[PDB]
Amino acid sequence: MAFNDLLQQVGGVGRFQQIQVTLVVLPLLLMASHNTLQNFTAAIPTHHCRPPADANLSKNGGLEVWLPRDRQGQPESCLRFTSPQWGTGATEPCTDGWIYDNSTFPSTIVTEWDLVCSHRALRQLAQSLYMVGVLLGAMVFGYLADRLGRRKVLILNYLQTAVSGTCAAFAPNFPIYCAFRLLSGMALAGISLNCMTLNVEWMPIHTRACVGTLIGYVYSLGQFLLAGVAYAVPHWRHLQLLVSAPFFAFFIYSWFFIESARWHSSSGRLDLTLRALQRVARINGKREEGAKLSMEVLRASLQKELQASAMELLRCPTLRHLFLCLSMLWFATSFAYYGLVMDLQGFGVSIYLIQVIFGAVDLPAKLVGFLVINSLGRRPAQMAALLLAGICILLNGVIPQDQSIVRTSLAVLGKGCLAASFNCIFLYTGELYPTMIRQTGMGMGSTMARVGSIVSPLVSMTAELYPSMPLFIYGAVPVAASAVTVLLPETLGQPLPDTVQDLESR
Numbered sequence: 001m002a003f004n005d006l007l008q009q010v011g012g013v014g015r016f017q018q019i020q021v022t023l024v025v026l027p028l029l030l031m032a033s034h035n036t037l038q039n040f041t042a043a044i045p046t047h048h049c050r051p052p053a054d055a056n057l058s059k060n061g062g063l064e065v066w067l068p069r070d071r072q073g074q075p076e077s078c079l080r081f082t083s084p085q086w087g088t089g090a091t092e093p094c095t096d097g098w099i100y101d102n103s104t105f106p107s108t109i110v111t112e113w114d115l116v117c118s119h120r121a122l123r124q125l126a127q128s129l130y131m132v133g134v135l136l137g138a139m140v141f142g143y144l145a146d147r148l149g150r151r152k153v154l155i156l157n158y159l160q161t162a163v164s165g166t167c168a169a170f171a172p173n174f175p176i177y178c179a180f181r182l183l184s185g186m187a188l189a190g191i192s193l194n195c196m197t198l199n200v201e202w203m204p205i206h207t208r209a210c211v212g213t214l215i216g217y218v219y220s221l222g223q224f225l226l227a228g229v230a231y232a233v234p235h236w237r238h239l240q241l242l243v244s245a246p247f248f249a250f251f252i253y254s255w256f257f258i259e260s261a262r263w264h265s266s267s268g269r270l271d272l273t274l275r276a277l278q279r280v281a282r283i284n285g286k287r288e289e290g291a292k293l294s295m296e297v298l299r300a301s302l303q304k305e306l307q308a309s310a311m312e313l314l315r316c317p318t319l320r321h322l323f324l325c326l327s328m329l330w331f332a333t334s335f336a337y338y339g340l341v342m343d344l345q346g347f348g349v350s351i352y353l354i355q356v357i358f359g360a361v362d363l364p365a366k367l368v369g370f371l372v373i374n375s376l377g378r379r380p381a382q383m384a385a386l387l388l389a390g391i392c393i394l395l396n397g398v399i400p401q402d403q404s405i406v407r408t409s410l411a412v413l414g415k416g417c418l419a420a421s422f423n424c425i426f427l428y429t430g431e432l433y434p435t436m437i438r439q440t441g442m443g444m445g446s447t448m449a450r451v452g453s454i455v456s457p458l459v460s461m462t463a464e465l466y467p468s469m470p471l472f473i474y475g476a477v478p479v480a481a482s483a484v485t486v487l488l489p490e491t492l493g494q495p496l497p498d499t500v501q502d503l504e505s506r
Helices: 003-009 013-025 029-035 122-147 150-169 174-201 203-234 238-244 247-255 261-267 271-286 288-294 295-300 312-315 316-340 351-376 380-400 405-430 437-461 469-484 501-504
Strands: 048-049 098-099
Touching: 003 261, 003 295, 003 351, 013 174, 013 203, 013 271, 029 122, 029 174, 029 203, 029 238, 122 150, 122 174, 150 174, 150 238, 150 247, 174 203, 174 261, 203 238, 203 351, 203 405, 238 247, 261 271, 271 288, 271 295, 271 405, 312 316, 312 437, 316 380, 316 469, 316 501, 351 380, 351 405, 380 405, 380 469, 405 437, 437 469
Parallel strands: none
Antiparallel strands: 048 098
16 A cells, blocks of 8 residues: 555656646547537437429429428428318328428438438437447446556547547448447547546545546536537538547547556556656656666555455345445436436527536536535435436426426526536445445446436437426436435545445444
């Protein structure tokens, strides 16, 4: 237990940590851009059926004669009249395609592949597939990082996101776009993980909490980046290329990253722990102190340092209770958060302004949450963050769509509350678990969060059954999770547990 004595000997936070951490967190700006890209690359333009080609519109007075009208008086999206009706007419599905409004969205995957009407669910299947990729990538790349290095896996992940995202932008058909979006997500899942591990492991333990916060706010700023970039590049092929082309530049400079000395020590190669520590000492400017570091020193000072299985979380009744409860908390927050963040069009305000507002809520939310977490408790904050979000989402479902300010304001408050729930469930889930199973437990919790993101688009596909069914679920699930937090034990002012016995004593 003295690597943190060696990292500090070699400059602590110094040029190397400033340079490398800036560079390793810069990609995370575009994680938000990719996760929620389909709000802009798949936006649904207003579509009405194409009148039959044989029919002449000059003669038949345009869409009026060939389009059945809904209660709103707007042309119906999925039907066209079988015969020309002038002034109960049979309606045929539309064989000749659809005419989409080009005012706001020139092209989207929806316009390109006619993912409209019967095939409307495909738009959400693609988001779910990207997220299946994110779940798969957290697991594949997590194993590969422990086997090949945090750095080598990052270099390959920057290249995969770049290649897969670029190829998605030039996808010729829908199956291919979905395949390259799953692979884009797999790579991005590995970037988000390895970005934490490489920075946290190269930074002193007194500055690990800050590393984690910076990463969180660098993601939130990504939401303003998506809004500004999407306004500039409305077309989807162009927007997908722009959001993925930066990762080729990341791949090019990632070759100069320094591999975690901690990963080297764990492997058994202290020769590379020494080489990394001396290189950093040259970079940080404490060269004399690096020369002093040799293998007689690094060994003895790293000997003491030289996690249990996930089956344990299930096997022990004490840790199974903490597992189940927290899994519901992580699923609920993600499931609801993605549900709300992935429906920007319904509110009645521009999809760009709403993206900006949503991203600007995360900033006062995270403070208010920090204030309530520390001042009141870590559990009262989780009941409040989840219950209030659930009440807001269910009231977005009940309030009529005519009200845009009442609906926009309640969705914005709700998204802010779920952002606070993400921040608290991270602290809550580290303080609740004993040291042996604490890293396994934070990974299982994050896995359940990714399962929430996969399940959320599938739930949204129930809109066809009922327009408000998607929202009533995205609201009921957080209300139920809030009730689950009652079971979990308060962690404010209590030291972190080291054994199951300690959880039990609590």
